[PDB]
Design a protein around this ligand. Structure first.
Ligand SMILES: CC(=O)[C@@H](C#N)c1ccc(Cl)cc1
Length: 313
């Protein structure tokens, strides 16, 4: 109908619904399962915990790492997790049984970041050892070691068909890699060169969102090599804080912050539309539910909790 219209944009109204207690040290990452049913958390306490995505109810603890965990990530079918640990390994877990399927050995220092590719036949990892590794999920063996950076690797992420990996480092660089060959296709340069603390592809793989330790998030068109948007106002000078695209309602950028708040920006206008108060330490990780307007946030060791926030839009 000619009267069909685009709705007037409405600011979100995320409100605290649940606080998820159980970790005994800083939480390091939270991620919603692709099927929307579960939230996984990792912690410096060496544990992974699974919680109901909608009701926040504790489901199970997954144990096995010998030291703290920095990151955890889901396979596309929501059946597997991979975790990255200070014990220098990654582990692949069967979520239903809680059992460790494979231990991925090869990094020579702390593993800081990890992700499955969309096909979920590969895992990519990044380490304090300055390398990015690509692993075969089935065999649990390392396929490629990329001499990716000259300082610790803060983030690694596949694009939507797994043909590219983006990595970031404290060396100040973002790099795009051809998954199949391991060859570097592009390097992003900042002449001021602040450490890059996080990077990920946009949900359509057209852009990359990168955090630098000067309180700044940037949306880059990596094919044109130009910055489209900048998001500021939060505090990020020390930690590798995740950022997200929220796409279930209004299109937002979401990030934790060193002032204990969750920041939500309008993706287009770059204005802060909400700040979520409640955590009592640095919000190191946030995640956005794949279908409902729900955010998970996780905080460092003065807090140790995960919070679930829900919005009407
Ligand atoms: C379903 C969506 O909104 C997304 C897709 N695909 C999306 C969101 C934000 C950006 Cl910048 C790109 C793409």
């Amino acid at each position: 109908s000619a009267t069909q219209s685009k709705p007037t944009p409405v600011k979100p109204n995320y409100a605290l619904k649940f606080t998820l207690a159980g970790h005994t040290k800083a939480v390091s990452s939270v991620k919603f399962s692709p099927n929307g049913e579960w939230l996984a958390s990792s912690s410096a306490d060496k544990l992974i915990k699974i919680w109901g995505a909608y009701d926040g109810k504790f489901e199970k603890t997954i144990s096995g790492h010998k030291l703290g965990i920095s990151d955890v990530a889901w396979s596309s079918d929501s059946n597997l997790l991979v975790s990255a640990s200070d014990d220098k390994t990654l582990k692949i877990w069967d979520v239903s049984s809680g059992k460790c399927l494979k231990t991925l050995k090869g990094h020579s220092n702390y593993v800081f970041c990890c992700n499955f590719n969309p096909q979920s036949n590969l895992i990519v990892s990044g380490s304090f050892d300055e390398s990015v590794r690509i692993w075969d999920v089935k065999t649990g063996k390392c396929l490629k070691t990329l001499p990716a950076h000259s300082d610790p690797v803060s983030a690694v992420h596949f694009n939507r068909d797994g043909s590219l990996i983006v990595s970031s480092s404290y060396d100040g660089l973002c790099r795009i890699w051809d998954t199949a060959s391991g060859q570097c296709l592009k390097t992003l340069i900042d002449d001021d060169n602040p450490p890059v603390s996080f990077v990920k592809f946009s949900p359509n793989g057209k852009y990359i969102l990168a955090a630098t330790l000067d309180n700044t998030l940037k949306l880059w068109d990596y094919s044109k090599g130009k910055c489209l948007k900048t998001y500021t106002g939060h505090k990020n000078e020390k930690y590798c804080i995740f950022a997200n695209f929220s796409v279930t309602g209004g299109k937002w950028i979401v990030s934790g912050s060193e002032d204990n708040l969750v920041y939500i920006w309008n993706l287009q206008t770059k204005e802060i539309v909400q700040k979520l108060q409640g955590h009592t330490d640095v919000v190191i990780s946030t995640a956005c539910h794949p279908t409902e307007n729900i955010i998970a946030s996780a905080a460092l060791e003065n807090d140790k909790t995960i919070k679930l926030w829900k919005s009407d839009c």
